[PDB]
Structure 1
Amino acid sequence: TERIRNVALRSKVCPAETASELIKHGDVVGTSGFTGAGYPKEVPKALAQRMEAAHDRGEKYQISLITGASTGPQLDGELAKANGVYFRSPFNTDATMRNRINAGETEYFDNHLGQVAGRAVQGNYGKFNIALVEATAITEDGGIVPTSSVGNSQTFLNLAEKVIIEVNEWQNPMLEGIHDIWDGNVSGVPTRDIVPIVRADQRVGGPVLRVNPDKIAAIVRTNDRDRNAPFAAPDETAKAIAGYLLDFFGHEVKQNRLPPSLLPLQSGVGNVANAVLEGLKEGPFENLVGYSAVIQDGMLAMLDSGRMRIASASSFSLSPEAAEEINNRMDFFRSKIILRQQDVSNSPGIIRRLGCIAMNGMIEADIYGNVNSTRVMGSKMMNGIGGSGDFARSSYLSIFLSPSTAKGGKISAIVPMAAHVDHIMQDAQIFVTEQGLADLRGLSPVQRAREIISKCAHPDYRPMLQDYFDRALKNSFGKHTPHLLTEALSWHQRFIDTGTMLPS
């Protein structure tokens, strides 16, 4: 049945390839798409091809690409291969785009996800020339129904001089109604409105994105899927991590420091956080509620088992099989899910009010519990800070999760000093690895070190960390946060030099 239910707009429909021609070299382009969900697919390809052709002719042809968060092969992948992006923000997971960024070929800045809208309205990315937005359907009165995410779409629509919509047969029409778009000033000119959310499951807006139909210069019909990586089935490492955390939650509850149903749950991107949710789907906490940035396979599983009643996020970010699953059971899941603008899902004011429990993965932490979420060896981008800072700093409890080692044991995820810092000590209270859990609340840096080294570090690396700390305590310039600057980053350099942090 017709997805474009507004007759007047049908006159604007055209091939993906024609739409792409609206985008000019130098253009700032805002797109839908949040962590592998709901990004535009067909127009990006056409632009990519046109870009390569122009480049061979010696014609400059690159855009600035601002999104909700990560997209997919069809967008980041295609444009990266074409060398078509001079600037990218705020979050990426595509290997080709990542390579461009790590080669200095595409400039990249990973803003806090909840701040992107406000900075765009402030003009930090320049003037938006194009909004390219994927839709489930266009309503009779011209509402744009989003797809598997909301992201920054409403903001990009407001800002852009011209709008291109992609309407996607693949997205299940029962998506219509799952979204909550608030028409208030969240990220506009101060003073901003109060967003009156006081419960994680509370709706305060409507089902559609609003745009002046006059700004719509093109509409493209599509039938393509959100392409995400599957999640790793929880192995012994992941299960141990879940085990420690569930016990921790259990002891908090027994001590009356958490309610039996805990607090609204945020769970970050990646395999480790996902694995913890798989643990929760059969855990001893009932009537859970999610207030997250993304809903991964594990969270969907919790909704499925009924251990979680409802989940708020800006997107569901699912494996191919789970995305197939939810599209086949959209009737069941649509009442369990609320998709919000990312500046609302990731609003520090709301997160703190609700008392969210934040659970996020990490590259590494140093012995003082500073956290790197992003930059391997301090210089090589993995994905980006994403919403981890939005949640870590605002949450009732901030929890970081990681195997105690990486690359088959050749890297320690607990190091003397993080090569890059995304989350300072103040923003991290709990660390969990397969070795144990460190509870850092109320502790000084030296006290944090003792907990982190003794609980979380891998036995292959523990003595070396203890050695570093003991000698730092003796020799450091100051003793408040003891360091030996000649060797603080030496494990990372050892890896670079030899392929392993383990000495020979």
Structure 2
Amino acid sequence: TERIRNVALRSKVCPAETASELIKHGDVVGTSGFTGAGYPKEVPKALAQRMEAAHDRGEKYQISLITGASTGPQLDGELAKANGVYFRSPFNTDATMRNRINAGETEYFDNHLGQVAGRAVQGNYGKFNIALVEATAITEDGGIVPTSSVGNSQTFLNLAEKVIIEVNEWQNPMLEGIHDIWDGNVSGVPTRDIVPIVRADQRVGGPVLRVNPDKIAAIVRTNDRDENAPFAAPDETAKAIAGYLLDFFGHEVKQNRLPPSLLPLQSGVGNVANAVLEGLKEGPFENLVGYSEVIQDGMLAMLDSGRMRIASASSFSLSPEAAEEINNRMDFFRSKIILRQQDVSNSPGIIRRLGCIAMNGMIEADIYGNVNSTRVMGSKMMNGIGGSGDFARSSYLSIFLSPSTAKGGKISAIVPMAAHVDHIMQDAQIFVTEQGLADLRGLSPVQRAREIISKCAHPDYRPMLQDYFDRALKNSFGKHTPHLLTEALSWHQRFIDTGTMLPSSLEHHHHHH
């Protein structure tokens, strides 16, 4: 079946290489793409080759790359390999791009995901020269049907001088209808519109991205896969974390602080999130709802079982097996899933109104429960803040979950002071590790420390943490949030110097005595 149903636009079809020539050195390029889903693939590959060829001749060729969130090897990977990106925002997971960022070869700012569209419209990234968007189909009236994510695509189409569409036949035609794109003012010039979502299953718009066809400079027919990461099977650490969390939810329900259907759930991807979703599938709940950034494998499983009634997201984040499952049953799943613009999925007004429960990962937390989501040792970017701030701050309950240690036990995920802060104490109420769960509601910082140290810290690090806290309480400049500035960041420096946060018995350490 023909994917370009508007006949006039068929005249704009051309090869990926030709389309890539529209993108010039210095251009700001906005693309589709979120959690490895729905990013353009063939044009970036062609662009990267041409970039490398230019560089080899001493000719500069780089772009500014603004996305929904993370992309995949064909986009972030190829362009990073080519050293073709001078500025990148708002979120990346590609390892080559991460290296460019951490070497200072690519300038990076990880904006809150729900704010990116608004900042783009404000002009913070400059003038958009190109929007490069993957599509399932183009409708009779020239509507652009997105693929496996919506992201910021509508905003980029609005802002960009020229538009390139990749029509990807790998993407199931029955994605058409799964998206909800609003023409309302969510991220435009104030005063903005009320975004009138009052339930997670509510549609407010239509199935297509809208763009003036006169801005469409090229359409490329493609056939290539998303980046469907291998399923991260829960290990025992993940299962323990999920057990503590599920026990907590059960207790909240028994105390009438949550309904048996909980509240709309936001979760992440990977080991721990997978364990939580498996637990939710089998737990004493019913009629669950997702209002999140992503649809993951375990969410499909609950939609299938009926445990989850609907799932709202901006994107899919599926394994190859789950992608095949939904591909084979898209008629069923399309009725259970709504994919929204990320400025709507991550709208603080909506998140608060629905009372979402936010469940997010972390690099580390300090004893006072300030959270680092991004910068190892304070300086080395991992992925980016993503929507963790959108959700943590706006949520009814903000929960952070992590193994109590990292790097095979050589790093403590609970530290005297976080080396970088993404989520302040006020934005984190519950911490869960494989050691236990800290409920910090209504606690002062010193009370938070008592709970975090006792419930969440690993036995290998708890005495060290207690020692820091005890001496800080005796010596700190103020006693409201006790610190010893002489050693607050010393465990991080110890890791940098020695490869472990565990102290040597060849020197004096206060907790050894």
Q: TM-score range by the shorter chain?
A: over 0.9
Distance in 1, matches of 2:128 and 2:477, equals: 49
The answer to whether the 8 A contact 1:72-1:228 is kept is no
Distance in 2, matches of 1:327 and 1:99, equals: 34
SS of 2:219's partner is strand
Q: How does 1:82-481 map to 2 (within 5 A)?
A: 82-481=82-481
The answer to whether the 8 A contact 2:233-2:274 is kept is no
- Deviation sequence 1:119-147 (CA, Å, 0-9, x none): 00000000000000000000000000000
Distance in 1, matches of 2:271 and 2:477, equals: 39
- Deviation sequence 1:40-72 (CA, Å, 0-9, x none): 000000000000000011111000000000000
Distance in 2, matches of 1:311 and 1:161, equals: 34
Q: How much does 1:216 deviate?
A: 0.2
The answer to whether the 8 A contact 1:363-1:373 is kept is yes
Q: Which runs of 5+ in 1 are unaligned?
A: none
The answer to whether the 8 A contact 1:40-1:166 is kept is yes
SS of 2:86's partner is strand
SS of 1:358's partner is strand
SS of 1:30's partner is strand
The answer to whether the 8 A contact 2:266-2:293 is kept is yes
Distance in 2, matches of 1:94 and 1:162, equals: 26
Bigger mean CA deviation after superposition, 304-313 or 50-59:
304-313
- Deviation sequence 1:102-130 (CA, Å, 0-9, x none): 11000000000000000000000000000
The answer to whether the 8 A contact 1:361-1:373 is kept is yes
Q: How much does 1:299 deviate?
A: 1.8
Distance in 1, matches of 2:298 and 2:70, equals: 19
The answer to whether the 8 A contact 1:429-1:441 is kept is yes
Percent of residue pairs bearing the same amino acid type = 100
Distance in 2, matches of 1:231 and 1:412, equals: 26
SS of 2:408's partner is helix
Distance in 1, matches of 2:80 and 2:326, equals: 30
User: Structure 2-normalised TM-score?
Assistant: 0.97
SS of 2:310's partner is strand
SS of 2:484's partner is coil
Provide the residue aligned with 1:44 in structure 2: 44
**After TM superposition, where is structure 1 displaced by more than 3 Å over at least 4 residues in a row?**
none
The answer to whether the 8 A contact 2:150-2:179 is kept is yes
The answer to whether the 8 A contact 1:180-1:340 is kept is yes
The answer to whether the 8 A contact 1:150-1:341 is kept is yes
The answer to whether the 8 A contact 1:314-1:341 is kept is yes
Bigger mean CA deviation after superposition, 296-305 or 470-479:
296-305
SS of 1:281's partner is helix
Q: How much does 1:297 deviate?
A: 1.8
SS of 2:221's partner is strand
SS of 1:408's partner is coil
Distance in 1, matches of 2:230 and 2:279, equals: 17
Q: How much does 1:228 deviate?
A: 3.1
Q: How much does 1:34 deviate?
A: 0.8
SS of 2:431's partner is strand
Distance in 2, matches of 1:355 and 1:244, equals: 21
Q: How much does 1:455 deviate?
A: 0.1
- Deviation sequence 1:163-212 (CA, Å, 0-9, x none): 00000011000100000000100000000000110001101110000000
The answer to whether the 8 A contact 2:134-2:146 is kept is yes
Q: How much does 1:419 deviate?
A: 0.5
Q: How much does 1:273 deviate?
A: 2.2
Distance in 2, matches of 1:449 and 1:398, equals: 17
- Deviation sequence 1:215-249 (CA, Å, 0-9, x none): 00000001101113223211111001110111100
Distance in 1, matches of 2:419 and 2:273, equals: 22
- Deviation sequence 1:11-65 (CA, Å, 0-9, x none): 0000000000000000000000011110000000000000000001111100000
SS of 2:282's partner is coil
- Deviation sequence 1:327-363 (CA, Å, 0-9, x none): 1221221111000000000000000000000000111
The answer to whether the 8 A contact 1:269-1:360 is kept is no
The answer to whether the 8 A contact 2:5-2:137 is kept is yes
Q: How much does 1:296 deviate?
A: 1.7
- Deviation sequence 1:258-313 (CA, Å, 0-9, x none): 01100000112443223211221212111000000111222222222221111000
The answer to whether the 8 A contact 2:186-2:344 is kept is yes
Bigger mean CA deviation after superposition, 111-120 or 313-322:
313-322
Distance in 2, matches of 1:304 and 1:98, equals: 36
Q: Which runs of 5+ in 2 are unaligned?
A: 504-513
Distance in 1, matches of 2:295 and 2:487, equals: 40
Q: How much does 1:390 deviate?
A: 0.1
Bigger mean CA deviation after superposition, 74-83 or 273-282:
273-282
The answer to whether the 8 A contact 2:232-2:270 is kept is no
Q: How much does 1:151 deviate?
A: 0.2
- Deviation sequence 1:86-107 (CA, Å, 0-9, x none): 0000000000000000110000
Distance in 1, matches of 2:303 and 2:242, equals: 18
SS of 2:311's partner is strand
The answer to whether the 8 A contact 2:28-2:63 is kept is yes
1:54 paired with 2:54, answer yes
The answer to whether the 8 A contact 1:6-1:138 is kept is yes
Bigger mean CA deviation after superposition, 306-315 or 316-325:
316-325
Distance in 1, matches of 2:111 and 2:69, equals: 10
The answer to whether the 8 A contact 1:374-1:422 is kept is yes
The answer to whether the 8 A contact 2:404-2:457 is kept is yes
Q: How much does 1:395 deviate?
A: 0.2
Q: How much does 1:415 deviate?
A: 0.5
Distance in 2, matches of 1:478 and 1:103, equals: 38
The answer to whether the 8 A contact 1:270-1:361 is kept is no
Distance in 2, matches of 1:275 and 1:400, equals: 14
Q: CA RMSD in A?
A: 0.7
Bigger mean CA deviation after superposition, 337-346 or 225-234:
225-234
The answer to whether the 8 A contact 1:267-1:274 is kept is no
Distance in 2, matches of 1:439 and 1:315, equals: 31
Bigger mean CA deviation after superposition, 469-478 or 302-311:
302-311
Q: How much does 1:441 deviate?
A: 0.2
Distance in 1, matches of 2:123 and 2:326, equals: 37
The answer to whether the 8 A contact 2:295-2:311 is kept is yes
Distance in 2, matches of 1:228 and 1:485, equals: 44
Bigger mean CA deviation after superposition, 228-237 or 414-423:
228-237
- Deviation sequence 1:344-383 (CA, Å, 0-9, x none): 0000000000000000011110000000000111111000
Bigger mean CA deviation after superposition, 488-497 or 278-287:
278-287
SS of 1:246's partner is helix
